[PDB]
Every structure is written in C-alpha cells, then in structure tokens.
Amino acid sequence: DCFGCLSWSHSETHLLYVADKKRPKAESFFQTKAL
Amino acid sequence: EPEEAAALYRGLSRQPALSAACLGPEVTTQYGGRYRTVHTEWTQRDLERMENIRFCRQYLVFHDGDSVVFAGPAGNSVETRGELLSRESPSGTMKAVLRKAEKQFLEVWEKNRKLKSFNLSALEKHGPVYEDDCFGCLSWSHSETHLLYVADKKRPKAESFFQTKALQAIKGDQFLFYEDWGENMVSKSTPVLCVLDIESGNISVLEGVPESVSPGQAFWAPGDTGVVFVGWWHEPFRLGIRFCTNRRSALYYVDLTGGKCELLSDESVAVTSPRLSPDQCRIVYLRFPSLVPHQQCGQLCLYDWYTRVTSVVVDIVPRQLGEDFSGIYCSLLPLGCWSADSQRVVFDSPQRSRQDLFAVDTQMGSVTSLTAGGSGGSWKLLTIDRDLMVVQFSTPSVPPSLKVGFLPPAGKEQAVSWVSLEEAEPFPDISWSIRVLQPPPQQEHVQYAGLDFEAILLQPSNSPTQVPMVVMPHGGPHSSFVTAWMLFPAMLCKMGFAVLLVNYRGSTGFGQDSILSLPGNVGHQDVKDVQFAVEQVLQEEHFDAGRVALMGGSHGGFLSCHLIGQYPETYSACVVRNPVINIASMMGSTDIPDWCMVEAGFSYSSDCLPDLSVWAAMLDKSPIKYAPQVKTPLLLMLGQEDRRVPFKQGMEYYRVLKARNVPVRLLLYPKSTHALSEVEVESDSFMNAVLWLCTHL
Amino acid sequence: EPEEAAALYRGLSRQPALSAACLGPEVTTQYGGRYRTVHTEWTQRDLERMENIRFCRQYLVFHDGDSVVFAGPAGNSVETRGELLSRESPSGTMKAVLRKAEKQFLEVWEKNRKLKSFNLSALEKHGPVYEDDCFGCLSWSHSETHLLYVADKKRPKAESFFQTKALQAIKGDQFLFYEDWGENMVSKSTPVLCVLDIESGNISVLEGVPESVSPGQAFWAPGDTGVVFVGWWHEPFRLGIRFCTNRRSALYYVDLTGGKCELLSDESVAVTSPRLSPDQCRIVYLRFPSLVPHQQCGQLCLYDWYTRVTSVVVDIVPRQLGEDFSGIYCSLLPLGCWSADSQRVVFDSPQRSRQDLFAVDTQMGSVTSLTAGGSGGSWKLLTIDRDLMVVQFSTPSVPPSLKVGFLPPAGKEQAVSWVSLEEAEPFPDISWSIRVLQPPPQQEHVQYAGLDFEAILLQPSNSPTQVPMVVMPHGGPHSSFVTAWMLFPAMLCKMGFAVLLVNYRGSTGFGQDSILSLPGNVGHQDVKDVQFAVEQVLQEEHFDAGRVALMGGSHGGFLSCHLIGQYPETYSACVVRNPVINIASMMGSTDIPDWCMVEAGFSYSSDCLPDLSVWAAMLDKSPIKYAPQVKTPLLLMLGQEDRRVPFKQGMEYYRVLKARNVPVRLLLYPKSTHALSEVEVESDSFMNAVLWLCTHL
Amino acid sequence: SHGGFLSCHLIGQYPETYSACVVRNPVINIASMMGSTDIPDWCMVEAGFSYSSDCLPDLSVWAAMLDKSPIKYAPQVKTPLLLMLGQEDRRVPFKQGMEYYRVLKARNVPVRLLLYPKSTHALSEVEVESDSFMNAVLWLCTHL
C-alpha cells in the first residue's frame, strides 16, 4: 500500500502499474563457457 | 524364526567382493631390492544405509625378477564415492578419473595434486558418458597427451508451439521417439567417440563412422595415427544387448583427420573384445560364427597390423579337446592379457562345473590349463603386467580370496606358484560335491547321442537323519553354475537344507553340441533332465522325499512351473522370480523377439508376420497349458519396470491359479528391474523366500 | 587485466595443503628389514566445483631402528567424502570412522571389511556429534572394547497448543531459547560424554558431570577405570570460545559407574590440552595464569597420577629466555607428543617471526630448539610415535612439503636428520626478508621500555625501478605473521607489488611484556608502530612513495581506518574485510563483550551497567572520529551472518563516507561469516581486491 | 515495542506495584539502537535533538540518550518477566531484549525468554501469534 498501484485508462485500452527496476546481469570470474 | 534368519543374513552378507585390480610401476631401492604396489577395489553390501559401498586397498610385493620374495599390506581401506571409470597412464605417473558430482567431471591426478579438471556438461558437445562394459571405454594415448572415450550423441534443441519469447530450436519435436538398446540401457540410443586434449582442453567428436553403426570399445592405433573400434549394426531396429553375444558387429579403424573408415574383419558375424600387443604389432579378438544362440562357444582370432593377415588361433570345440579344455565361453577378455614377449594370451573360461585359467600360444595354437586337477574351485584373472598375474579364488564354502603369481616360461606353465595376498576364513559347516548324470536311452536324440550333464550338491557336514532338499535350475538357458561363492545357497545350507544346482543339457562349458541340442526342444527335454537328476539324487543319497522344494528365476521359473505342472505329486513348495509363462504373448512385449523364435525352433527374420502354425507351436510349449493341474503353494516376485520379461506374464499365471482357489502369494516391486539387484529389494525377496520355504517345509 | 589475474589465481591455488598424518604398525620382513606406513590427508581448492576437496595418500619408510634407510610412495591419491572424525586403534588393527551420509554413522574397519556400523540417529540418545577442535574428540579404550566421544545433549519433545491427535510432549515450549557458544558454533549449547560398546551396541551417557560445566577433550583413565576431561564454566552465560584461551575451565576425572567427579587442578584459571604418557603414569597440560587477554604466553604443567603432585615444567618468559625461546603460544599440543621413554615432550611454537620445533625434558625443565638457525621458515609437527616425527615445512616462497625424522637421544637433539617424503617446486620470483624496528623515544611507555617489533618484506626478485607497496597489519590484536606459505601475498608479489607485513607491539612470540603493553593503548600505539615501519621502509629501500596501499581485516581494518583517517596524504587505496568501527556500539551485539572493556583499559565484570566515562573512553578510541578527514578510495567487504563483528559497523562508516561524496565500493555476502572462507566468496573477494588495487595504483 | 519500553520503566521506578509483565520486542537502550535500526532519526527526535545526515557521535547526545533508557533501572527490577523476540526484526534489533535478559539473569530473577528465528517485528504469523498469545495468557494466569 506504500508504492503499489494498478490503474485503468479512461479509454480502457492500457493498464498502469509499478514494478521493480531491472538489474544488469552478472557472472563470476571463473565460469565455464560452451565451446 | 525371523530373528535367526536375519542374524544369519547379516553375518553372511558381511563378506566383501573383489571388482578390479591394477599394478603400479617398478621401483628399485638403494639396497638392491625391487618391489611394486597393487591397487584393488572391493564392494560390500550395507544394510544400515541399504547401499552397495565401494572401497579401495593397496598391497605391496617385493620380487626378485622371477619369484615373489615378500608380500604385505600397505595401509587401511578408504571408501570412495562418485567414481565411474578410471585408468592409469601407461607410464604410471598420471591417473584419469570420471566422476559424478549432478554433473559429470573428468579429472587428472599426478602425485599429491589434481592437475586438471574438466566440466563436460558445460562445453555441451555431447550427452552423458557411457560407463557400462558394453560400450564404455577410457583410453590413454601412447604420447599421453590425449584421452579417448565414448559419450552420447547430442540432440537438437526443441521447444513448444506456444512459448513466450522475451521482448534456432525446432517447434513440436520435444516428444520424438529415440530407440534405446533394451534392458539396463535406458536412454542409450547412439554413442559417439570423443577425444580430449589435456593441454588445451578442446573436445572433438570424430567423423567418418558409418551412419548405421554404434561404435564402442575403442583404443588408439599404433603410432597414434587413428582409432580402432567395434561397430554394432542397429538397422532396421536395435535388439537386446545384455548377456547376448549374437549381435552383428564388425571391427573398424578410422583416422584422426576427416577420412573414410576401413574394415578389418568380416561384416557377417559377431566380433568383440580386441586387445593390442605390448609391441604394437598384432591384435587379438573373439569371433562367434553364428547368430542363432544368444551364448555359444567362440573362436579366438588374430590379426597382423603390417602384413594384414587374419588367422584363427583357437577354433570351435564340438565336445571336448583333451581332458581340461571345452571351448571359450567368456564374453570379455581381461584388459591386460598379453605376456611380456607378445606371444601368449592368458584368459579364464568355464570347464564343466568349474572355472579355470588357460594360456594359449598364438604362434603354434596350443592351450595349457594353469589350474588343472584338484577338487574344484573358481578362478578369475584381473590383470597381468610384465608376467605378474593377479587372481581371485573362491569355492562354495570359501569367500573370495586374492592371490598373485608369476607366469612361468613357455613349456612349463603347469608349475606356477601362488602367494596369498588376502585369505578368507572358510565355513566348515558346508560340504559340496559334483554328480555326473547320464540320460536314459529314451531321453536321447539322434543328432547328438552320448551327452551327459552335471549337478552340484551342497549339504550340511556332520549331519546326525532325513533332511529337506531345494532344487535350483539356472536361467539362460545358455548359462551354467560354477563352483564359486554363492550367497543364498550358502545360507540355505547353513540353515539346514540340502541344495542341488542342476546344469542340464544346453549349458555353457560342455561343448558346442550341448549348446545346439537344446533349441527347438524346450519344455520337454530340460524338464525331464531336472526330474531325472532329482530322482537319482533322492534314490542315491537317501534324503527326505516328502520335503522337496523348487526355486528358480526367468527360464528357471519357466522350468519350475513346468515341473510343478507335469509332476504335481513331487514338490511341496515353489519360488519363482520373473518367470516366463506364455511364449506366444511374450513376443510383442520383450526387447529380444528373436529369442522366442530361436527357442521354439524357427528362424527369426525381420519384417515377419504372425502365422497360425508358429503361434500354435509356441503355445504348445508353455507351462500355462498345465495350469489346471497345479497343486503346490506358490510365491511370486515381480519387478514392474522389467523390460527383458514383461511382468504381466506372472500376472496371467497368478489370475489362473487364484481363479481355482490355490494358495498363492504375490509381491510386486514398483521400481525394480529384471535383476532385482537393489539392496532393499534383494534382502526383502531373500527373507520372504526363506520364510516361505521354512514355513511350508 | 582480469584474464591474467584469473590465470595466476588458478595456478597459485592449484597447490594443496597438509591437514593430518598418522603412523602404522611396524612390520618385520623375512630378509630382516623393518618398515612402516604413513597415512597423510591433504586438502585442495577446486574452482570447477567450487569446493574444498580432501584426499588421502600413503607413503612407506624402511628404517634400521635409529636411521631412515629408505622412503617412498605407495600408490595414488584417493578422494574421500563424508568423514568427520577418524582414529586408529592403539594396536593399529582397527579403525573408527564417523561419517555423514543426512544422518550420522559410526563405522569400524578391519583389514578389507567393515565389521560394524551404528546409526546414531536411530537410537535417539543424544543430538549431533561434535566434530570441532574445541570440544570434539574420539578415543579408544585400552582394551579396545569401547569408544568414547562427545555429542549434544538431548532436548525434551515439544508440541503446539493446537495439534490434532489421532482418533509426553510439553505444549508451548518449541520456541525456547538455547544459548550457543558463539562464532562458528551455531546450535552448540551443552555437550555430553557418550560411551559406545562395540560388542553389544548400547550407548551410555555418563553421569556425575557438574551441572554448570561443559565437558570436552576426554580420554580414558589408566586401567580403564574412568574418564578424564576438561570442563568449561558456562555460568551465568557463555562467552566466545573461538581463538580465545582466557575462558575459565578445569580438569576433572569421573568414574564409569555413577559417582562424584574429582578435581585435579585449580578452578580459577584456564587449562587445556591434556595428554597421557605412553606408560600411563603422568599427564601434561597447558595453563594460562590470567583471563584478561584473549591470547598470551602459557605454562606447561605436569601432574603425577599416583603421587598426586602438580609441578610447573615450563613457566612464563617475560621477554626472552636465551636466543631461541620466547614462550609457549600454541593453543593445542599434538595428539601424540611424548617420546618413547616418557621423559621428553615435543611441540611447535612461534619465535619472533618464524615457527620452530622445541623439545622439553620434564625431569629437569630445559628447552632445546630443534630447528635453530638458518634463514627462516615455518615448521609444523603432525605426530610422533616411537621417536619417529612427521613434519610439514614451508616458506613464503615454497609451498608446504612433507618430511620425516628420528628424534636423537637426550642431549643431542640438535643433530636431527630430515628425509624428504614430498617436495614442492619453489618460486624464484619472490624474495623475502625480515626487518627489525626500534620505536623512537617519544613512542615509549614507562612500564615496558626497550621493546622492538618486526616486519616481513616480500619483493619481486631481479627487479629492473620504482614499485608500489601494499601494507598489511594482522588482526588479533594478539596474533602474528610467520614466514609460512601465504597465498594472497604471493599473488601480490608475483603480479608486481611489494608486500610489507607488520608485527606491531602486542603480537605473540615476543614475550609477555609485549602482550601486556598493548591493552589500554589501542588506536594510538599500534597505528604509530605501523606508520613508523612504513616510513622507515620507504626511506631505506627507496620504493615509489606515490603508490602505497593498505589492506587488513577485523582489527586490521580498524588499524587501516585509523591510518587513512589520521594520515590522509600517504595512502592511495584501502581494502578492509569486516572492520571494527565503533567500539561503544559493538558491545551490545558481539559475542565477546569483554574484549571491548579489556582493549579500552577497563576490567570486565558480569552484571555491569553503562557508565558515561567508560562509553566516552570507548568513543574516543574509534576511527569514526576521523571520518570527516578521509580522502582515500575505499572498498568494503561484509558478511551478513557474522557474529564476531556485526556488519552494521561497516555500514555506519559507509553511510558517513557516502554522505560526503567519497568514492566507496561495498560488497555484501548474504550467507557468509566472519572468516569468508567459502571458496566462491574467497575467490570473488580476492579478485575484487586485486582489481581495485591495480586500477587505483 | 515503545509500550514495552514504558513497561520496563514501570517495573524499574515503581517496583512494588506490579506482579507480572509481558513485553514483545521492547526498546531497552536508545544509544545502541541508533546504529542498528532503519530509522536513526527516531532516536534523535525522541531524545530532543534535531536529526541531520553526515552527523557524528557526541558525548552530550549519547549521555542524554543513555539517561532516558530503562536499563538504568535494571538493578531494581523485582517482577517476573516474559520476553518474546523476533530474530529477523529490522525495526528494533533483537539484541536490545538480550541485554535486559542478561542483566536480569545475572541477578537471579525469574525470567522466561522466547525467540522466533524467522519472525518479524509484527509477529503476525498465525502460528507465532497463537503461540505468543497462549504463552502470555498462561503466564498471566499462573502468576496472578
């Protein structure tokens, strides 16, 4: 109830909500890659 | 009482078993003595964790070049976990290990460090690695720079028609059918040969293998120029491969670079087990002339690498060659089988009711028995390197023991001296003997006349005096009983019974004529042989004729059902594991459809159709025909996931017997297989069988 | 570049480490020679599976009674899995193993068979078995009929108020609080002594232990009449036990039958590590006179079993006793430490900046150094049996190596000959030396005048010539750096840096006065010692003064923060792992509240209350006071599940620095601990630290 | 929480009035609560000072914070106490109650402690709430 929401458009064609920001992918220094 | 039986089972199962052995490099001391180490692998049941544990132990041998000066142990036992295949380098300085830890890893060990490790799953060049004895292998190069093994062919990626993509792969091919190789080979369709470079780490899949063959049992060619392997034909469809040596196959050689395969044998029969000489000049392998019987006497053949000439070293023995040889029946030669001079080959083979060690000179073609004479026993050869052999010896009253020896020079192999590395305490409460039985004139066929069979009798020593008897025929039907350490017969003998194991006509170790006599006569020839043996033993030894029981599995269950159907006033109990009841309906559900035709007396051909005459002949030889006359209490054990013998075969017999109000007990294991080799399953089945036998007798 | 750093890290971490060793029984050959086997355990990091693997290897030694004729290997390396504790029987014929397979099992091995196995979880007499070096133990009886170990006390069963019963246990007690022993001892509240009978299989928990003590480190009394153990007081509440030797404890003996415990020492100080003589006549142990410092010089004391007389064999050394001894600082004696004659005791101890082996005669009280002289090095004693010692040797430029030797007779211990069992290839690109530093007259205290400290300098050999430097102070603060094989300093030296490890005043191995000087002066004496060492090294060796970096952990992080706060124009980079920032707020969250009072200069007492003067004094000694003056880039690593140092301490510093726009990088490991000893965590932290250092320098 | 705070004060300044006490996640030491809570401004605001970022610890502020804590009256406590704590609480760290528990136990005072390893500040889980309420009612009825 602090940040969450879910709203309809006046034309009822789009929906609006709030999500979490995407984080860049990460990997370890010692990772085996496919040959 | 269940408590005493459980205590006896715990006591008897404590004995371990020997699986493999290898020899280390030679070391010379400053004083002048020379010694070398031996690594042995043992396996043992564990009822607390209900698992088969494996451990390793090391021994040390001081020798003077041609005699064993001293031998001893070199530490305690260490239990391993995860090892699938292992191999020591030719120089003995490096070791290659395949481990499951679930992913698969290939590790290289040297001294007290692990030099390199490769995660075969991450590279994604193939599937799971084969670890069985049919196709699996792991070989070092002569330069010790590359490794060769066999893996599963990679499958194209697949996806569903309705898959969400984020804001290549075939669609609708995730449920295609990939045929496997049958029993104990689930999800094993098409193997491929893989070569790994240790220094760099790149894995390469060899090209040039024919598109209609499965490769296996590969080793590096002389000079590291190519790879020699065995190709099994899998067209138009795959047949069963376990305990069957009548599958069409050939020997091929392929260059490392992209090139065409070269044929080295005849592409009409079955060949197997090729080994290369120490001097890298000749190869030896086993060839089987026909494809009708699943097991038969074989030929030992030699191939010269440079002159390209093939000769037959050891041929087929019809009945007997002398008094100690009857043919080659082993399906695999030892990994090391050549002598130091690259002239003689040492192996082990059944002989009547025992197992012996033989040495054959490839130059001339003579065969010499190394363990001739004596009361009996079972020998197994594990390895030989620089004329030093490691063997395991066991008798029905003695658990396996480990010995070493030196191979004498040519012409004096009969004077080999054995030194005991590990000895086991015998059981003096068991006495075993061998009986020879000659069939009556009525039960003889014109083609093969004069054949005789054998039985092994175990009884409690120092008996006070009427005792019960338990009769066991072997499966196969082309197999045999040998005078080795068997657990359940030992338990039955120690608990108070007398065990009679029958080797009827058609067994291995008695010649090719014995093998060829049985087919086409199942259901009336073996049944009579067992009945004659039982009657002769009862009339000779003067046992208690009122308490006789039967036990067998697979074809043994077939024979037991036939016996309790045709002679309903002789036996008082019966135990069967995965029996064969209806041959006609077994054709469409088993993985070896040719077995039914071969045993019924007809030739098997692909693209065949059901015929009334063939089906009537198959139905006339089934024990179900004698179902209404059954009067003996029966206990059945079935494995639901069995592919060799479908489990509905026993269900038909159970329903027929239950419809007539006959005492029948049934046990079904949902996740077990044909062998019932799981520790919990095996223990439960054995305890139930012994309780049934003691209660009804 | 990350690729070169990763390759270097792999190459350096490929080296293994030695953990334990034991000696087998003596064997006499027919020729006349005598030999025995040695079993060694090694551990090694594996980055493919990201795990610490453990394996075992066996060696063989031929001796003539007083000299080593020959030595060699006896096979390959075998990797084990699941072993927690193991012990060989006194006669050497049987082996006891504790395994986790998740339940816990106790197994007995003899020759090539596992005689017995016990599922300790099924009997339900206690909890999990202790396997640490603080309380864990596993002992054989003199008759080899019983086993003694330590387990967790059983808790009464509990259930909820609202539980459905089918148509005894306390209700509402499932969330009670059970206090544990602190860091690395999660869910370890109250241990108990357990005795197992091998023949029968019944487990018994001994009675008579005082209700306010925790028992540990137990062994059988002479004649198998009772059990001797060490009891740690846990009233009114438990304090931290890891790396702390100032915990009140005593030595007790209790009979097997129900009876009252007997006291054998003084119940006012800390005692530890009791060992019994081979002739079962006397005991030796370590005693610490005070409880204020967490680590200090100790006393070696002897107790006679029959005369019941206690004497002090080795006493406290204030500054120096000769030129090779400075006191006993090891917290544990070897499992086998007595000579064959039950007269001399062999151990290892730090000495200035090295680690040496010492032999002490209990009759007189003299101490002899076995590895005196030379350039330096680090020795560790693993075992001694029948005057045959097994040792591990390492230097900053040489990985650990394994050697054996024979103890000379009394009065000639300086002429011991070592025979190399396993040798490692050195790294010629590292050159190390030792510097001695004398503080200026201003930085001296009246009570202890004339003390000096040391540093270890590692540099790349054959340098062309301005190089950067990395300065490392140790934690503790009562610990030290020794000239042993360290991984990260070696990597930094090989990559191009010069490493300076400082042993400031207050370290172990320099006498009791050095230990006692530090407390009450933290924050202004240690910091200055490091600054003086850095300035002297820079002015002498003529390095690159523009590129100097700091690195440390725990108290090392404390010192690093103090250094970057008070001298903001000297260092250009800093790396800290779990630092201590605010002493005042650390009291209420750590498991050792007495540490803050002891270091701040006050006496610790239970049932104490916060006072303004004490809290002001604690706040005056914290690096946070110098936070506004920080100008150096900082990289922080924190473990969220750390109990020794709460992770909010670093968060306060991070917030303060970030509020002023200072370049700061922070890494948080959700499931790591104080040590950060996980393979993945350690590798990631080391790579991040090296990348930060190379980028900013 | 804060009410439990008050409760502790009520058993330190007036030790001859109440015969039982139950507290859930109380606040014991304001001075040491600053560095572990997620709302550091609360301590300054309640203690009478203005909160500003990039601040430093001062002797006067810390003394004022310590003078207002119930721990000062710990030696005078005479009432049986039952404590419930949630180990994964971020609003009020659970060591605050542990300090009070240790101080009271060092003087041989009847104290019962319950710790929920995976609970939070609210203790809103059904099992946790039911167990805590039943334990509280049993304690109250037994001691009254």
Ligand SMILES: *S(=O)(=O)c1ccc(CCN)cc1
């Ligand atoms: S069963 O155990 O009698 C049986 C029959 C035939 C085969 C094929 C040959 N190995 C296997 C098992």
Ligand SMILES: *S(=O)(=O)c1ccc(CCN)cc1
């Ligand atoms: S930290 O590594 O500086 C540190 C400080 C004090 C101790 C207690 C004594 N072992 C442990 C770690």
Ligand SMILES: *S(=O)(=O)c1ccc(CCN)cc1
């Ligand atoms: S506790 O329940 O007393 C407590 C105190 C202060 C706050 C912050 C304002 N919501 C929350 C809970």
